[PDB]
Amino acid sequence: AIREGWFRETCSLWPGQALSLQVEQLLHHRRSRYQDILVFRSKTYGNVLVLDGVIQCTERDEFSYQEMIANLPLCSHPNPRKVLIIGGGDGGVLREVVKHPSVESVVQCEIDEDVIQVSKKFLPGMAIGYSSSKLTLHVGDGFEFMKQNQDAFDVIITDSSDPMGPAESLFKESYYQLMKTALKEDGVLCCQGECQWLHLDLIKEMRQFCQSLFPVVAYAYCTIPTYPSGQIGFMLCSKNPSTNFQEPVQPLTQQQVAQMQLKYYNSDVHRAAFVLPEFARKALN
Amino acid sequence: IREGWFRETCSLWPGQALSLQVEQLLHHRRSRYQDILVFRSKTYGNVLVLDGVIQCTERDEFSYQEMIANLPLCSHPNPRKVLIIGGGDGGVLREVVKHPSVESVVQCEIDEDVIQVSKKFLPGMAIGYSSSKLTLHVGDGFEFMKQNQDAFDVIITDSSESYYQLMKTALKEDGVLCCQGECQWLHLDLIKEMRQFCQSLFPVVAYAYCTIPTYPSGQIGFMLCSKNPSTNFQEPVQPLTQQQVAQMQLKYYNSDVHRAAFVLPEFARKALND
């Protein structure tokens, strides 16, 4: 796992490539009921969370994914008040969601209470999210949880672990119809998508599936050095046929961006995040 | 390479590394100038490494090569005379010669061995050298730049402060340039300095980036400078139709990608503008 002062992330889902991060200190390494949980202090990326050997987050670059997965759907809804987060154990998405004055309630369904405990100790900049009075924390498999809800949420965000392990249930295509049912009449969702440089084929399949369920479906991406190939995508679906994901229905003023202490997201960034490389544009359109 | 993998370490991106799995070592010799290592990787095709730094992979080279040529070329109303500094692999050349307006491309490469290894092991890049527009020159592009005055519409540095004044002198009146820039996730402080430096020499300077998995942190930037105070780098003065993108066999660049490439994450927007 950690060899000669370095941790190397390998996975069959990104074959023949690897990020390694230099390790200053092992902080924590224990198996929960669900997954292997490894935390270390890296030399140059601050603290790093690893779940079943896949990097979940680093303190240095967390902000780009966290701000983007939160603000892409929230800024694409005229009045999001009830929000659902599936996953999100580190508290980082919550941190970003609760920043919006419109949001009154955020329900978070995390399967693994141990991820929460560990993040509260080792990811303080992320787990500050758990101090919000708007949070309802729920325990369980988000797949089965989604079934409990109908016409309940304005926004659903899936901040998922990886395909093996407990997140597999969130990768069943039926989950997307569960989310459609849980959403209000005009609700929107955002899920962790695929990297367009690694799994464009899966993005194309997922987009065509969602297009069969939802009037408006979009893919966006952000950059983040410590996800495979240095970026990741988001699936965005709306039940509102007038939603234009590419042009924020809630543009943020520079005052708001400053007040929200955003380090990645702003309204122009939002727009540009849907402009894909020609190969990806061609494949999806 | 160790245990079947090549690991790229460099003190300029400390504490981090890309490894690529090696299927077969193909070439490993020092030239007059640098260590040259070519391997067939498992999933990125052939990989050229100079002094331990990854230069290109066949899988993803198209992003950088397309962007470094089309950003300046599509920001000039009629680029006819082009200069490439570096470009050993032929790839930027490949992209430049696609433009009907381009009549001559001078390429100054210091290391003739890089050219020969690329012709053998990077054939999809080295097809650039079959262009009739090429004038191939040998030597240090720095001292080469001194020889030229009022000569080029566009200068691209495809690389492994004074140099920028030399480029300005070498450019025509309304000439433009594109140099490989820093990664905004790695050296934003250096981008800020270089921008302030260029802004002192040129009426119009801009920074754009592209994504490319096998450069450090998964992306790289470009410095764009123009001697024409009317140049708008962000909005291409030569937009491409879908038919043109198609005929040009572009896999990364198009006119929307050109525009978006200047839209920086907030931390960098703030640092370069505020």
Ligand SMILES: C[S@@H](CCCN)C[C@H]1O[C@@H](n2cnc3c(N)ncnc32)[C@H](O)[C@@H]1O
């Ligand atoms: C750490 S967070 C990802 C890091 C970027 N914020 C991913 C979380 O998803 C949880 N997870 C994985 N599968 C599920 C299911 N099925 N349900 C709810 N939560 C899940 C897992 O325990 C991590 O906390």
Ligand SMILES: C[S@@H](CCCN)C[C@H]1O[C@@H](n2cnc3c(N)ncnc32)[C@H](O)[C@@H]1O
């Ligand atoms: C391989 S290419 C970069 C890969 C993406 N096209 C970098 C080239 O720049 C050359 N190079 C390095 N220094 C110089 C100088 N000083 N002058 C000209 N060419 C140079 C080097 O030999 C490579 O061929």
